[PDB]
Amino acid sequence: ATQGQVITCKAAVAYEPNKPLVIEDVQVAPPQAGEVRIKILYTALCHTDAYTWSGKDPEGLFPCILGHEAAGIVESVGEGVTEVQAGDHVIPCYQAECRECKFCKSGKTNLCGKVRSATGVGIMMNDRKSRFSVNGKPIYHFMGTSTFSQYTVVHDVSVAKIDPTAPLDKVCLLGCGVPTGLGAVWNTAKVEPGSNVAIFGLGTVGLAVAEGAKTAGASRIIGIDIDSKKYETAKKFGVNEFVNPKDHDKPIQEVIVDLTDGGVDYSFECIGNVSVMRAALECCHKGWGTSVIVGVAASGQEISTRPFQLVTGRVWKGTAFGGFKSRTQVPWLVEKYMNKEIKVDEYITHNLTLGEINKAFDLLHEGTCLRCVLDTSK
Amino acid sequence: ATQGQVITCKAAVAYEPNKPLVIEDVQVAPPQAGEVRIKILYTALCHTDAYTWSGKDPEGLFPCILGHEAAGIVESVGEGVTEVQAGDHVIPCYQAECRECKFCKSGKTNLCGKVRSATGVGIMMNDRKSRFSVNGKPIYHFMGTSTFSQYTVVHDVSVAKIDPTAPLDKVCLLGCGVPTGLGAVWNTAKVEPGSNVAIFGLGTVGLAVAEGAKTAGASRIIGIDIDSKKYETAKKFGVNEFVNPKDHDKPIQEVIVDLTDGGVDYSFECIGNVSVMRAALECCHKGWGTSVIVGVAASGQEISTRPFQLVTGRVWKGTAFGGFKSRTQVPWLVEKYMNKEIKVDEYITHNLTLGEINKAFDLLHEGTCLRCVLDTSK
Ligand SMILES: NC(=O)c1ccc[n+]([C@@H]2O[C@H](COP(=O)([O-])OP(=O)(O)OC[C@H]3O[C@@H](n4cnc5c(N)ncnc54)[C@H](O)[C@@H]3O)[C@@H](O)[C@H]2O)c1
Ligand SMILES: NC(=O)c1ccc[n+]([C@@H]2O[C@H](COP(=O)([O-])OP(=O)(O)OC[C@H]3O[C@@H](n4cnc5c(N)ncnc54)[C@H](O)[C@@H]3O)[C@@H](O)[C@H]2O)c1
Ligand SMILES: [Zn+2]
Ligand SMILES: [Zn+2]
Ligand SMILES: [Zn+2]
Ligand SMILES: [Zn+2]
Known part of the structure; x- marks a missing residue:
């Protein structure tokens, strides 16, 4: 024994x-x-x-x-x-x-x-x-x-x-x-069928957000990653549009807003980068868009935005x-x-x-x- | 005519x-x-x-x-x-x-x-x-x-x-x-009976929040103002505890967390001061607390926090x-x-x-x- x-x-x-x-x-x-x-x-x-x-x-x-x-x-x-x-x-x-x-x-x-x-x-x-x-x-x-x-x-x-x-x-x-990742979609955001979603970082967390969003019935599932080889992999997980920030001079938030005629219904930051967290919030749609921080920032790092982002109906949360x-x-x-x-x-x-x-x-x-x-x- | x-x-x-x-x-x-x-x-x-x-x-x-x-x-x-x-x-x-x-x-x-x-x-x-x-x-x-x-x-x-x-x-x-102020409570936040609330700034907007919170059934309705004369006035609107930040060495968010054994269920910023907006987020309870920005900040000014605040369950909104x-x-x-x-x-x-x-x-x-x-x- x-x-x-x-x-x-x-x-x-x-x-x-x-x-x-x-x-x-x-x-x-x-x-x-x-x-x-x-x-x-x-x-x-x-x-x-x-x-x-x-x-x-x-x-x-x-x-x-x-x-x-x-x-x-x-x-x-x-x-x-x-x-x-x-x-x-x-x-x-x-x-x-x-x-x-x-x-x-x-x-x-x-x-x-x-x-x-x-x-x-x-x-x-x-x-x-x-x-x-x-x-x-x-x-x-x-x-x-x-x-x-x-x-x-x-x-x-x-x-x-x-x-x-x-x-x-x-x-x-x-x-x-x-x-x-799954829970960020199903529990924290509660993504509805037909929602458009942006996922920043397509590692295991971001790929599980994509799976969760697909399962929940999301429409556009836009992946964002600085490594463009991540997209072919991500497709199987439900990502169905892709943007690399490196291919655009304009801030990535501005690119996603253009792409979606106003922004996404939900975004998920799956990296741990406070600048990308801000971008994730700012690409959400006015009136109703919600950003979920999933990545874990380093000690002392801060997220910022202008408060008009929230006054005009965006919601900032995390999981x-x-x-x-x-x-x-x-x-x-x-x-x-x-x-x-x-x-x-x-x-x-x-x-x-x-x-x-x-x-x-x-x-x-x-x-x-x-x-x-x-x-x-x- | x-x-x-x-x-x-x-x-x-x-x-x-x-x-x-x-x-x-x-x-x-x-x-x-x-x-x-x-x-x-x-x-x-x-x-x-x-x-x-x-x-x-x-x-x-x-x-x-x-x-x-x-x-x-x-x-x-x-x-x-x-x-x-x-x-x-x-x-x-x-x-x-x-x-x-x-x-x-x-x-x-x-x-x-x-x-x-x-x-x-x-x-x-x-x-x-x-x-x-x-x-x-x-x-x-x-x-x-x-x-x-x-x-x-x-x-x-x-x-x-x-x-x-x-x-x-x-x-x-x-x-x-x-x-x-009323709707920030009834519509944005959806404050439940028995909630504890903090209200930062006791002008017309903050007092309207106080009245909304009292009407919704809130328990503790904690007012914060730099002008202590504002309290006696606020009481009839529903405010039932008061803190002047000038009376404390510690940041106000820390005072409010100490006063509530962990933070409030809902906070409302009713001033337009980005530093206060941050305080109001940071005095919300871990796991569930929500802060609503009601105040309109000067153009260009940013709100900031550490994203651990949101990952540990606080939600930042505005109206x-x-x-x-x-x-x-x-x-x-x-x-x-x-x-x-x-x-x-x-x-x-x-x-x-x-x-x-x-x-x-x-x-x-x-x-x-x-x-x-x-x-x-x-
Ligand atoms: N909130 C939680 O409970 C929880 C639990 C587990 C993991 N996490 C966090 O989630 C994050 C993701 O973890 P993982 O295992 O998927 O990480 P990972 O390293 O596998 O993936 C991160 C991805 O982000 C991409 N990336 C890096 N910088 C980028 C940028 N500037 N723009 C766009 N894409 C970028 C990388 O190319 C990579 O594909 C980590 O911060 C981790 O600590 C959080
Ligand atoms: N979101 C919207 O749709 C909307 C609509 C109307 C007004 N507002 C905004 O709401 C805010 C308040 O308006 P009001 O008419 O009630 O203003 P007010 O000037 O009457 O009241 C502000 C109060 O905040 C107090 N104060 C100032 N600095 C403070 C600090 N550092 N900490 C604590 N208290 C502090 C003042 O002493 C005062 O009592 C304004 O920013 C206004 O622009 C927003
Ligand atoms: Zn792990
Ligand atoms: Zn209209
Ligand atoms: Zn007015
Ligand atoms: Zn327990």
């Missing part, structure tokens, strides 16, 4: 920014009250991992085990945990759903405050310490998930129980970019995980995937192993790369 | 920015196709008039007859005019409602449309000339209204027909500030004329007033004559002045 015992396993440890990750045998402590220990079978990576690895995350603490997009099988649960048990298939989520805080009970938001005071500084709530160690020294958790590892320990309030027949090498993507409540709705997303109503496989452009994680990180710089999934068994 | 004749009457003319208005006899030409000539009995003044008069307006065309808040009686109508006739009591409105343009037909906005190509450059649609002259030299219209005169000519699409028993020296306020459709809904607001369901009288702190209009502009500096109503007979 591994039950109640320390597990020794392989993990990719980031000891310093910009140094290659080291595959180590780490000690993974057993789960304390309200905790779940998960055997991670597959983990994806994205630029959020890379940002922290690169030393730019104000919350980054080293050494740490990165990774926040994964799916595995519960090994063991700690005292009091009732919603999952050993053997359940699960997606650990970086956004919790406690069901008991003011945010959860509001019915007006998917934010949840419950464990953020621990997860944001790389530790567990129960004892304000890590469950990972190498040579008896602690290793920080990351985003409450730490999925670059054969085993992790997470808060129960962050574990989504999923269909046990769903392929774990695909549904790992339902912990980040795909829900955020966190697409407005989805993680424990309740990630499983539903998995169901939709199993019934072929959402795409997941099409976002997975590469498959490597945890051992090749440094090689995976090198792929993030390639324009053709959407998500890369890692098999943690080797 | 005066129908078909040029009328000679008193008007206050602005010959250039920043000089006292000249009370002159002027010639008011008869109405042409789709026009209405109105005997104005009472007109108020506001910031919008002063913005142009002071030379701050970029549209600023001189010489002109300023004024946009008024009530009167129709003296005659032009060819094709069917919805009003001689003897009707009316409020001319700077916001048109044609019912026939893409915006009027949309059902998603109040922002017509139909006569701006003329009103925006001080003339009439039918012949692209002005109806006003002095000594044979044209005087431009303003805002499609020009109500600082005993008679004016306005496009039919801008004329609200109202209860002929309503007092014209009170309902002259129902073409600008009072509707904007034009409180979302009310002028011709349809101004008569409804008059009905509400006559049935004692909305305040109007209480916003009128001073009464002067058109002869005294320069003293009225002086009162716009007066902390004690909300609206000043001018009797055009002298």
Whole structure:
């Protein structure tokens, strides 16, 4: 039995920014009250991992085990945990759903405050310490998930129980970019049939917005990206018009307004660039257009516009995980995937192993790369 | 009888920015196709008039007859005019409602449309000339209204027909500030019973927000003003807590978040100050708070925030004329007033004559002045 015992396993440890990750045998402590220990079978990576690895995350603490997009099988649960048990298939989520805080009970938001005071500084709530160690020294958790590892320990309030027949090498993507994009359309914007939409940035997030908009019945789905090779890829996801800002001297907002005789019904910024966020708002139609910020700006960066943009009827909003409540709705997303109503496989452009994680990180710089999934068994 | 004749009457003319208005006899030409000539009995003044008069307006065309808040009686109508006739009591409105343009037909906005190509450059649609002259030299219209005169000519699409028993020296306020503040609450924000609200600026607009919020069922109605004398006044309008930012070292948004354990459900900026607009966004509650810009900022000034504010669930909006459709809904607001369901009288702190209009502009500096109503007979 591994039950109640320390597990020794392989993990990719980031000891310093910009140094290659080291595959180590780490000690993974057993789960304390309200905790779940998960055997991670597959983990994806994205630029959020890379940002922290690169030393730019104000919350980054080293050494740490990165990774926040994964799916595995519960090994063991700690005292009091009732919603999952050993053997359940699960997606650990970086956004919790406690069901008991003011945010959860509001019915007006998917934010949840419950464990953020621990997860944001790389530790567990129960004892304000890590469950990972190498040579008896602690290793920080990351985003409450730490999925670059054969085993992790997470808060129960962050574990989504999923269909046990769903392929774990695909549904790992339902912990980040795909829900955020779909949900930006379906939950945050509530895009109606016939709407015209602009999507700025055609990475995994922007491609999931395109899928969500297409599914919701949008008409024009105009993609905007500085890399023109993104368009052929994006077509399959629903983008049906394309503009590269580099092909126009006029501000991209002015180009989209011209193209649409006044602007779009909804826009989505899927990059993290405050200038492009402004452009996204300014290309929305007067009277009713709504812009949704999905990208995450760097610390200290600000969005600006002239207030007449809002006085004359444009609405500025943003989204966190697409407005989805993680424990309740990630499983539903998995169901939709199993019934072929959402795409997941099409976002997975590469498959490597945890051992090749440094090689995976090198792929993030390639324009053709959407998500890369890692098999943690080797 | 005066129908078909040029009328000679008193008007206050602005010959250039920043000089006292000249009370002159002027010639008011008869109405042409789709026009209405109105005997104005009472007109108020506001910031919008002063913005142009002071030379701050970029549209600023001189010489002109300023004024946009008024009530009167129709003296005659032009060819094709069917919805009003001689003897009707009316409020001319700077916001048109044609019912026939893409915006009027949309059902998603109040922002017509139909006569701006003329009103925006001080003339009439039918012949692209002005109806006003002095000594044979044209005087431009303003805002499609020009109500600082005993008679004016306005496009039919801008004329609200109202209860002929309503007092014209009170309902002259129902073409600008009072509707904007009420509707910002009822139409733009859709404030729910039990909401907590912050209102930045307790002039006529902010007090109208207070009354809208109180009527909608709001709980905490927190007023913020740099003039603490404004509070005692605001209480009757519904304001039930007050903060003067000068009494705090911390930025006002931080004070308001501390006072409300996280922020308000809705905020309203009722000043026109881009820094305050930002504060009003940043004092909204995480996950759901919405801020509505009601204030009109100087041309060129930008609003800014960090986009994490919107990603974590605050929504930034703004309003034009409180979302009310002028011709349809101004008569409804008059009905509400006559049935004692909305305040109007209480916003009128001073009464002067058109002869005294320069003293009225002086009162716009007066902390004690909300609206000043001018009797055009002298
Ligand atoms: N709000 C949330 O809850 C949430 C969750 C996940 C990811 N995100 C954010 O979404 C963003 C997108 O992530 P991703 O994994 O899709 O990123 P990505 O790197 O795969 O894609 C970004 C795309 O933007 C394009 N781009 C860059 N600069 C551009 C510009 N100036 N104009 C137009 N296109 C431009 C790139 O060519 C690329 O196609 C990131 O900021 C990420 O942090 C947000
Ligand atoms: N959106 C629209 O359709 C529309 C229509 C009418 C008026 N407006 C605008 O609404 C705004 C207010 O008009 P009003 O007639 O009520 O103005 P007002 O001058 O009577 O009132 C402004 C109030 O704000 C206060 N104030 C000034 N600076 C402040 C600060 N830094 N912090 C807190 N309080 C401050 C003043 O003390 C005053 O009490 C104006 O900008 C006007 O242009 C908008
Ligand atoms: Zn991710
Ligand atoms: Zn919670
Ligand atoms: Zn006004
Ligand atoms: Zn119209």
